[PDB]
Symmetry: D2
Amino acid sequence: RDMKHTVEVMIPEAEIKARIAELGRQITERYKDSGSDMVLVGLLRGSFMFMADLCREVQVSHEVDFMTASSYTTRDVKILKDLDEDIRGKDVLIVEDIIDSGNTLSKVREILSLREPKSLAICTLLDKPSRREVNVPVEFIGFSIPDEFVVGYGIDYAQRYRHLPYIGKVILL
Amino acid sequence: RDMKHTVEVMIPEAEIKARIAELGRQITERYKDSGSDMVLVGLLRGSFMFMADLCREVQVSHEVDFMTASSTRDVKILKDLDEDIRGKDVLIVEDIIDSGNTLSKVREILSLREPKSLAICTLLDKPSRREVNVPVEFIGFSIPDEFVVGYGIDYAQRYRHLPYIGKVILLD
Amino acid sequence: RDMKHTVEVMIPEAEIKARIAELGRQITERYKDSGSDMVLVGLLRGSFMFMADLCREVQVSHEVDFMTASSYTTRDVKILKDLDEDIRGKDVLIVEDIIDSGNTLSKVREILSLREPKSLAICTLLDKPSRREVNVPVEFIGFSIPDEFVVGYGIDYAQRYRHLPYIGKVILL
Amino acid sequence: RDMKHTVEVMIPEAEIKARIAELGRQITERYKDSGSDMVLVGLLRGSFMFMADLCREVQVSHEVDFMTASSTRDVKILKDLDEDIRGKDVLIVEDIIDSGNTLSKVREILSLREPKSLAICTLLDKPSRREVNVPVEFIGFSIPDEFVVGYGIDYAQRYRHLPYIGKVILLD
Ligand SMILES: O=c1[nH]cnc2c(CN(CCCP(=O)(O)O)CCCP(=O)(O)O)c[nH]c12
Ligand SMILES: O=c1[nH]cnc2c(CN(CCCP(=O)(O)O)CCCP(=O)(O)O)c[nH]c12
Ligand SMILES: O=c1[nH]cnc2c(CN(CCCP(=O)(O)O)CCCP(=O)(O)O)c[nH]c12
Ligand SMILES: O=c1[nH]cnc2c(CN(CCCP(=O)(O)O)CCCP(=O)(O)O)c[nH]c12
Ligand SMILES: [Mg+2]
Ligand SMILES: [Mg+2]
Ligand SMILES: [Mg+2]
Ligand SMILES: [Mg+2]
């Protein structure tokens, strides 16, 4: 949190926009013939930018909701802020910025599943298979990256760089 | 919500105090030799009073925590617990169980956090209106099909401060 | 949080019950001729036991509500859980377990005051004038104690002793 | 909530994108020489999209935080901020201001935490329905008295994902 560093571009703004466009088309095809109500659920705070760009590329009538989970050395996954709307009998797509361990995301899916939605999938922008500690079903993935320390596009470093339009790598000096 | 009514006594303060003492001895005897941390989890708002009196009758070192749930519809968490319950003996403390919809869903959520044991203690039980068969190990009173008030329990945000359990009787 | 210790009785269960009875009579006289709706507001978690005993000794029709404030090195006072009901045009009595610095309580009163209640008073069970860092108006006080490390009656020590029916002092060994 | 209607365009995506770029340069020029930490505070849910596009146009190192408020009645905090704002330049990011009741009360609450500066940036402003004179330093569009949807803003939880601002037109 307190180290001399700099930031290089890893995934340019244009690459993200192109990849999200594709994701939008995939998500659209998977839920266009569903009929039931659909809702995209974002995990604050990292997902807000990804959510904003993604939901615009989804050509299906859907709702947008958010929830906040507890961040932590091993502790219970607690809900700091639940969803505003109901999800039972609905198509729910959890929208994440990045999956590493998948601990929090695994628990969140369990909690949501109890509310018995019609379907329940996960869409993450970044994925680190390397750091996975729990196997979680992830239907849509934007980028698979090695264990690199990335920032930008909602992802922070000591609350910094959330507003970068590009995914960047931090170089410790 | 604005209906003319009266409140008759159903369970006097002395009866509650005595029954809670008994519940205390039973809860104590169950968890006294556990060797794992114990926590009483109250469901706000209606159970604050029951919780305060109950934990004072529980002669084992335990923690006290609270949780606020919502409402048919989905059961959402307005205020989650403050502390972890993983590997702990958890006792859910609820004021009253009518249908059991809320308890059922709250127990599910907490069970996901893998506590050593998960049990429920309710002051009032109204089995004539149960829709879901939830398992309760401690019950203070099984009551008739009456709309009860007092002791944390309210009627339109009214009567929570009554030291006794009463029943609402509407005028004709 | 990790020290060898023991607990002695400082304020017996019976003394608390007697003092709360008196508080109930005072509070009752101050608000019996008000007319407006009344609500007792408790600060979780320390206030739950004090709230339960106090509201029963208040012979005035009132509502009971709770809220949780952020606990922390100097940080913003944040609301982890707000009130469930409205308080504008009402007689509001904040119910606290203990006042030391009065930092959190001062901010909480400010936040609540913005909602424009008819009146706004504070009732605490214990008071340490010694440790006061901010001057806060406190209309009702159960006990004034010196700077002693107390537990019990909702007050904890590493989440312990909340359930003690008596106010106790911890003796570090 | 269940009324038959249509959605006509009021502000096209290109117009929003261009206007947000301008807002970006203005916000940047104001806070570029502050020397104090900056934070954009969004009011959920309706402002997530505006926030995402806006902060990408703000060329100063800042933090992004969110807050959920309620609704007449009292304005309560369902979800408070995650980080402190004391001694920081705070910019409240809101989707639309009709009456201004919520903004007015939210600004009051945040001001209590004594930030270095407290300002408001709204995408849409509908002054024909303002009940409280709240001070806004940045406004994307001042709009006619129409029920707008899209770009985070909803009609009965619908249309939040539209890349443009539209207006709801009921059928006769
Ligand atoms: O490369 C990173 N940059 C910044 N943060 C992180 C994290 C920690 N974490 C992000 C931080 C969450 P926050 O402190 O913003 O609430 C990712 C965990 C997602 P998962 O448990 O479901 O897999 C993991 N990797 C990174
Ligand atoms: O006899 C009763 N007296 C008063 N209330 C009730 C209820 C409803 N009450 C208890 C419901 C228990 P459930 O039927 O879910 O098993 C819910 C109120 C929660 P809130 O005040 O935070 O909104 C059910 N029965 C009674
Ligand atoms: O003697 C004590 N025992 C246990 N805790 C404490 C505290 C800390 N604090 C109690 C701990 C609050 P918690 O960590 O349970 O959320 C009292 C602050 C009240 P104020 O700021 O309005 O004056 C101060 N004194 C004691
Ligand atoms: O033109 C509009 N389109 C859509 N909605 C609105 C509103 C109400 N909308 C904005 C209110 C702003 P205010 O009038 O307080 O200045 C409140 C919805 C909050 P919620 O979705 O979390 O419950 C006011 N105007 C419009
Ligand atoms: Mg995330
Ligand atoms: Mg209950
Ligand atoms: Mg306190
Ligand atoms: Mg808004």
